[PDB]
Ligand binder design. Structure first.
Ligand SMILES: [Ca+2]
Ligand SMILES: [Ca+2]
Ligand SMILES: [Ca+2]
Ligand SMILES: [Ca+2]
Ligand SMILES: [Cl-]
Ligand SMILES: [Cl-]
Ligand SMILES: [Cl-]
Ligand SMILES: [Cl-]
Ligand SMILES: [Cl-]
Ligand SMILES: [Cl-]
Ligand SMILES: [Cl-]
Ligand SMILES: [Cl-]
Lengths: 600, 599
């Protein structure tokens, strides 16, 4: 129905857009560089369109990427995506290992409220704020980190991951408390408690080791799981997600023990998600066919359930159940890819009429802490599954809609597993030249205006801009030149030492020098304006993205010879600020924008 | 009893504080310089604690000083004040002549609203605003200008003043309208109309010339005067003042003609001012004995009536009436000088517990366009009669009380006349070395702070200040130097060129250059910060009184030898802005503040 291989290819690439510094050599994202290099634990993924490392959904996401490989890794070699998926997973797992503090782990990097208040690119955030870290032993977060490492250890044949999976599970299981999990409250609060994470982690450890202690542990946790409302049934009227993986764990335990209790649960849970429902109870459905669990991230939930439904259907023999669960799963993936009332993809950079304004700071590429400027994103966030439409299938592609246009690690995670299943069956060819190079716009440049003209001086207002985005970055040794023709000075009988440079304004905190007037060739002379710490010119807000200087170059008062109209850098200047290519910008001795007199 | 000669001396000196530029060479006020030199008409007096030239009260005030001389000029020799009063009057009269525009006159310099919105010194106001002028031929303003020049022609023996007096009288009398008198609205509106000015001017022209044609014109105007309420009597229940001089004109006509009608008016009017009243009717009196006509300028009114009463009493023979009017007059002057429930002078710089916070911008001497800072006036407005107390004798000396602490030309004018009469009688000695020199503050100076320090640089925040006040003034070629000792640099093996001058903030609008680093002597070096138009540093408001620059003097990055602790201009600097004498200030090549290495 769709090129599922291309969808998969893009859906994986999304995680490379999320990578924190240092980036691996193989990162394919031209607009991402090393970022947050001062973090207490390096690497791993930014969670969403923000720059926080939230370990609970991060580890959940990694676990689900592992699960995708565990089920379908062998079945997808024609898509050419296995190695991409593997190394993207390893990048996250390496971070979870690096978080170890023995009796505790680093479980968060960045303050949610502080991070979210600012809108700008990953690579420049350290100019705006200083990022804290958080340590604890919350059973949910540590149990999820254990689970991710347990499945990772299988699919990546890695004994280190298994060692740390066991370290973390033991800690989580001994602690039996979420009390030290606080830094993520209101962002990724532990809602369901921690028994489901212990179940999920122990189940994966059983599947990793075959050690029956882990199966016995797993089975011991089931009576501690939350009930469905006031009944005695284990809760089933929700989705497998970052907060609660018991749903998927029950499916895995149905396959592993073959016990009827696990099969009964899986069928009750999945039936509730299907159009036919479960004895009169059913998830809300949009008229367009999307199972719509909640206001936030409906596509995330429905596509994750699609993965669970595929795995369960593939693990059973009943033809009617297999067809019912398969059709449900494929229907939800196809809705996300364009089988909906608007015939449109909900995956950035894929299919027909994809979203172009995901709520994602670094893909946007602002310079001044605004969402509305630039009005179009500078970068393509390929593969990102957005939050999706409302309950009535309504949707508009708007950067301001932080619900419908949300993007996140956990949104993509189960989705990857479901695309693995579909490309395994249907094939499809990935895009050969992927990703294609972006059209860039100008990054470092001067905007200038005639601030005042006089019969004996020129006064310039000049703004040296850093609107970098490919990737956003900092240049320390920034300078620009203002070129003049002094022919008329010499012809009137004056000399270079008769011309005075003065300053009428220089912006606070921008350490700057202006050179003496310097000979280029013939009668062509220039001044260079140098910012000693040019990194302070950075795309982090209204004040910082450019440095303003007003300089005056003046012949003696009363003289009548000064002629700016033959000066190279005066060309095209008006009384309103405008970008000019005739005041070239330099990084050290290397010209990075503009033109010089006489060219190359 | 008071030293009325000293009070007179100071009350005259007040007018020197009021002079607009160019100042005469004899001006005695150390804190006044040439001000408002771009005005359409130069000289004359600022009206009050503001900088508007309002011709109606200015001319009234000059007419009153002329009248003082006319009556008492020969009688005030012991006081030594005749010459002072004379030349102060001529200064204003010269302004009145210079307003002539043929078919009209300049009658105002300044926009009252814009002038009053700003708080600062006369000498710097042109940096804040452009001052418009206004031309017209209002009968009241022109007629008062005529009167002032007519009495001035007599007492200063000046034919030119007489010619202009006649020309202005004729213009006012031809026009018979205040319709062209507009720019003073709400400040000095013509309330009484103009007939009283024509009466006052024609009376003075009669006294100047002896030409009975002017007497005939004067008498022709009295039926046109306003009535008292709905009655047939000429209005009498108010004071002679800048708006209405018919009161004094009638007293002059009583003496000149001897006619009963003028004497009846004069006694009706003065009786109403006295504690005994006019047929049961009387001006309000405070319990402390001040005749209190109105909320605004009660001392101005009472002291002006004192002068009228003295002149009328001196002109009659009846000893009972003479005593009654003389006692009234002296009681009011004495109230003003300290004979009141608080035993306090209402004349700045005189007597016991005088006002110290008159509502006067130039005597205050701020640099910030604020009334509250400085908290004490930097100058002494000697001789200014304030507005004064309320109806209950209540008063507080507060700069914000623009009623009770108002000061003005017209407030002093009748007062001088009355003081002439009292010093004529009592013959006191003026102060010998008047005025004494004031304590001054530093006017042009740097305030500096260490903005940032590191192992390889010094960064200074420097504010170059103009808080001038003796007098407030402007200096274009301003600079200051910053001196350093580089011994630590050569001793570690580095040179001068290992040192870079940069800027981290340059206040908008302050065109500046910093020289290259310069050797003084030995291992002592400096930089010079120069403002190209230093006049933009001026005591006109929060932004303008100082120019801020942040400059950094830097060795190469990473090194650790830099040692600011032996730099001359670094001495005493903290991380808080403070005045420093070690960053000296220059006007051109001349040091005006601070110290240099080696002296
Ligand atoms: Ca949980
Ligand atoms: Ca030229
Ligand atoms: Ca009048
Ligand atoms: Ca030193
Ligand atoms: Cl169904
Ligand atoms: Cl835009
Ligand atoms: Cl020339
Ligand atoms: Cl070029
Ligand atoms: Cl006119
Ligand atoms: Cl009486
Ligand atoms: Cl103060
Ligand atoms: Cl010295």
């Amino acid at each position: 129905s769709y090129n599922y291989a291309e969808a998969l290819q893009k859906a994986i690439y999304f995680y490379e857009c999320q990578q924190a510094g240092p980036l691996p050599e193989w990162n394919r994202v031209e607009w991402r560089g090393d970022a947050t290099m001062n973090d207490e634990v390096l690497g791993g993924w930014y969670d969403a369109g923000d720059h926080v490392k939230f370990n609970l959904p991060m580890a959940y996401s990694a676990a689900m990427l592992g699960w995708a490989l565990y089920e379908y890794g062998d079945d997808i070699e024609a898509s050419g995506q296995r190695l991409h998926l593997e190394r993207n997973l390893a990048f996250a797992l390496d971070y979870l290992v690096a978080c170890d503090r023995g009796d505790s782990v680093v479980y968060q990097i960045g303050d949610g409220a502080a991070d979210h208040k600012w809108w700008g690119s990953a690579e420049v955030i350290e100019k705006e704020m200083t990022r804290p870290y958080f340590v604890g032993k919350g059973s949910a977060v540590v149990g999820q980190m254990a689970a991710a490492l347990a499945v990772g250890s299988i699919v990546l044949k890695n004994d280190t991951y298994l060692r740390y999976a066991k370290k973390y599970f033991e800690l989580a299981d001994a602690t039996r408390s979420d009390s030290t999990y606080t830094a993520a409250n209101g962002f990724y609060s532990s809602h369901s408690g921690f028994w489901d994470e212990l179940l999920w982690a122990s189940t994966w450890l059983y599947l990793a080791t075959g050690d029956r202690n882990y199966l016995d542990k797993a089975e011991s946790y089931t009576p501690k799981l939350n009930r469905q409302n006031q009944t005695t049934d284990i809760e089933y009227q929700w989705a497998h997600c970052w907060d609660d993986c018991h749903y998927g764990a029950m499916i895995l335990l149905a396959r592993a023990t073959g016990k009827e209790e696990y099969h009964k649960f899986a069928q009750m849970h999945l039936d509730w998600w299907t159009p036919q429902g479960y004895n009169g109870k059913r998830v809300a459905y949009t008229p367009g066919g999307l199972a719509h669990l909640d206001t936030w991230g409906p596509l995330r939930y429905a596509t994750t359930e699609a993965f669970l439904a595929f795995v369960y259907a593939d693990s059973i023999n009943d033809p009617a159940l297999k067809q019912k669960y398969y059709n449900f799963a494929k229907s939800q993936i196809d809705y996300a890819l364009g089988s909906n009332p608007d015939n449109r993809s909900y995956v950035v950079g894929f299919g027909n009429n994809p979203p172009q304004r995901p709520h994602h700071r670094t893909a946007h590429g602002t310079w001044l802490d605004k969402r509305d400027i630039p009005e179009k994103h500078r970068h393509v966030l390929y593969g990102a599954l957005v939050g999706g439409p409302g309950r009535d299938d309504s949707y508009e592609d708007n950067i301001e809609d932080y619900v419908k246009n949300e993007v996140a690690c956990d949104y993509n995670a189960g989705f990857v597993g479901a695309l693995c299943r579909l490309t395994a069956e249907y094939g499809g060819t990935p895009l050969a030249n992927f990703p294609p190079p972006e059209q860039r716009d100008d990054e470092f440049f001067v905007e200038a205006a005639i601030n005042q003209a006089s019969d004996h001086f020129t006064e310039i207002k000049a703004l040296l801009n850093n609107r970098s985005s490919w990737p956003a970055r900092l240049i320390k040794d920034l300078s620009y030149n203002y070129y003049m023709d002094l022919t008329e000075v010499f012809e009137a009988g004056y000399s270079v030492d008769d011309i005075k440079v003065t300053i009428g304004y220089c912006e606070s905190g921008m350490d700057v020098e202006i050179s003496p007037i310097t000979h280029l060739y013939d009668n062509i002379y220039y001044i260079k304006i140098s910012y000693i710490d040019g990194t302070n010119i950075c795309p982090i807000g209204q004040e910082q993205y450019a440095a303003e200087l007003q300089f005056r170059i003046a012949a003696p008062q009363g003289t009548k010879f000064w002629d700016p109209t033959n000066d190279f850098s005066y060309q095209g200047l008006t009384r309103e600020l405008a970008k000019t290519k005739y005041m070239p910008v330099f990084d050290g001795a290397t010209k990075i924008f503009g033109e010089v007199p006489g060219g190359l």
